């Protein structure tokens, strides 16, 4: 169970190109869109809807149709430098503030 990569160098440079990542999915039956996953740095493992970020190495699965690739990326892998490059710390903080406040409301 690897620590998340927080450096500015990708863990998996073979998956650094959008198109390389897009090829990993094949026919995608799952509720979240493969282009939206690939744009958020994710590629498919081939095992259910398990994906990994090319840069941080961070893995996620069990995608509900309401879960957004970028939000989940920020929620679980907040140290990812690819996420910071693409989205900015301000998007990151919003998302973080939001998912903590989602929790309050429920209790």
Ligand X SMILES: C[C@@H]1CN(CC(=O)N2CC(C)(C)c3ncc(Cc4ccc(F)cc4)cc32)[C@@H](CN2Cc3ccccc3C2=O)CN1
Binding residues for Zn(2+), as ranges, are: 53, 56, 73, 80
Containing 84, the helix (H) or strand (E) segment is helix 81-87
By the 8 A CB rule, do 31 and 53 touch?
Answer: no
Cβ-proximal residues to 105 (8 Å cutoff; 6+ apart), any chain: none
Cβ-proximal residues to 38 (8 Å cutoff; 6+ apart), any chain: 18, 21, 22, 25
For residue 105, the minimal CB distance to ligand X (Å) is: 18
User: 26 contacts which partner out of Zn ion, ligand X, Na ion, none, CB within 5 to 8 A by kind?
Assistant: Na ion
For residue 77, the minimal CB distance to ligand X (Å) is: 8
Contact positions vs ligand X (CB under 6 A): 45, 50, 52, 59-64, 67, 72, 76
Q: Binding of Zn ion at residue 55 (CB under 5 A)?
A: yes
Q: Binding of Na ion at residue 26 (CB under 5 A)?
A: yes
21 vs 24: CA distance, rounded Å: 6
- State the residues that interact with Na ion by CB under 5 A: 26
- State the residues that interact with Zn ion by CB under 5 A: 53, 55-56, 77, 80, 82
């Amino acid at each position: 169970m690897n620590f998340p990569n927080s450096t500015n160098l990708p863990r998996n440079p073979s998956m650094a190109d959008y198109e390389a990542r897009i090829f990993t999915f094949g026919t995608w039956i799952y509720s979240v869109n493969k282009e939206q996953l690939a744009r958020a740095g994710f590629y498919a493992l081939g095992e259910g809807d398990k994906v990994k970020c090319f840069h941080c190495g961070g893995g996620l699965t069990d995608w509900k149709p309401s879960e957004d690739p970028w939000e989940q990326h920020a929620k679980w892998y907040p140290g990812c430098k690819y996420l910071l490059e693409q989205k900015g710390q301000e998007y990151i903080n919003n998302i973080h503030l939001t998912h903590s406040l989602e929790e309050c409301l429920v209790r």
